[PDB]
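Hey forum,

I'm writing up a methods section and want to include a predicted complex as supplementary material. The small molecule is 3Q1. I've pasted the protein sequence and the SMILES. Can someone with a working setup run it? I'll credit the forum in the acknowledgements.
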Amino acid sequence: QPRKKRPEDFKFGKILGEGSFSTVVLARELATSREYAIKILEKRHIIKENKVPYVTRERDVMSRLDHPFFVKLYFTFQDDEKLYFGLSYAKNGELLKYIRKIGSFDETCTRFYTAEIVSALEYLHGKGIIHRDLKPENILLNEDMHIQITDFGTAKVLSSFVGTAQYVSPELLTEKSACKSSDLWALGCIIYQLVAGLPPFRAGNEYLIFQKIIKLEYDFPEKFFPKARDLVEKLLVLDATKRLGCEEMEGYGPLKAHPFFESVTWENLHQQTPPKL
Ligand SMILES: Nc1nc(-c2ccc3c(N)[nH]nc3c2)cc(N2CCOCC2)n1
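Reply by user p_vandermeer:
Happy to help. Structure tokens for the complex are below, copy them as they are.
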């Protein structure tokens, strides 16, 4: 392995993302002219807030992932005050940006991008890993317009915390208990959001959102691809064990075989040319 890199190895530029405990900065490594998304974390703040386990889990998970639909951790280093994670740079940014830009996706784009997310999840879940906070902000777009899912500090590694309110599954609001089905619920929301342009559970505040979730209080616009709607209904199911794609439903076989994916070739998605938005 190469020498431990250092801040002076890079020319830093614009800010790509911001979280409570981190900032993502675009940086060009000088010796290679490669662009990386460097995630910068202030040690003191992490310790002060008891986030060390989250930072640790992210590093450990993003190292174990080796798949085109996931942002990669290439390296790490630190100075006196800060940790640096060198991440894949997804030039086109958040999927959320595109949902806003174009309003909502047509069937073909919905189909392609949903299949990529399913395929990513299948890989993630195959490694006994749960994202727990899947959302359009987390689903980045590469320069070639394929997805790269990021942000893994809140993931769980199958042998406490609540993600973004709108994508939170009912079981989290009723037991503090998560599983692969939690990601599948989020998948249901995200699909709904690609088609309708908005997330299925909206309200004035988090409490009300949570109220709708446990009540399964949402509904479909009249202009909602029927097969997409049928799939969404098989995902947004209160009982976590009855969600298409989960182990009690026999996994990703039946999920990938859903009529909505009729025209999908699952094996080489990443090699296919994404439909234009
Ligand atoms: N892992 C992780 N990645 C990113 C991130 C953001 C933009 C990126 C890009 N354009 N290429 N790569 C990127 C990675 C942010 C993040 N934060 C931000 C929000 O707070 C939660 C954690 N965490």
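Some notes you might quote in the supplement: Residues 16-17, 19, 22, 24, 37, 39, 71, 87-90, 93, 140, 150-152 surround 3Q1 (CB under 6 Å). The domain at 1-93 is CATH 3.30.200.20 (Phosphorylase Kinase; domain 1).
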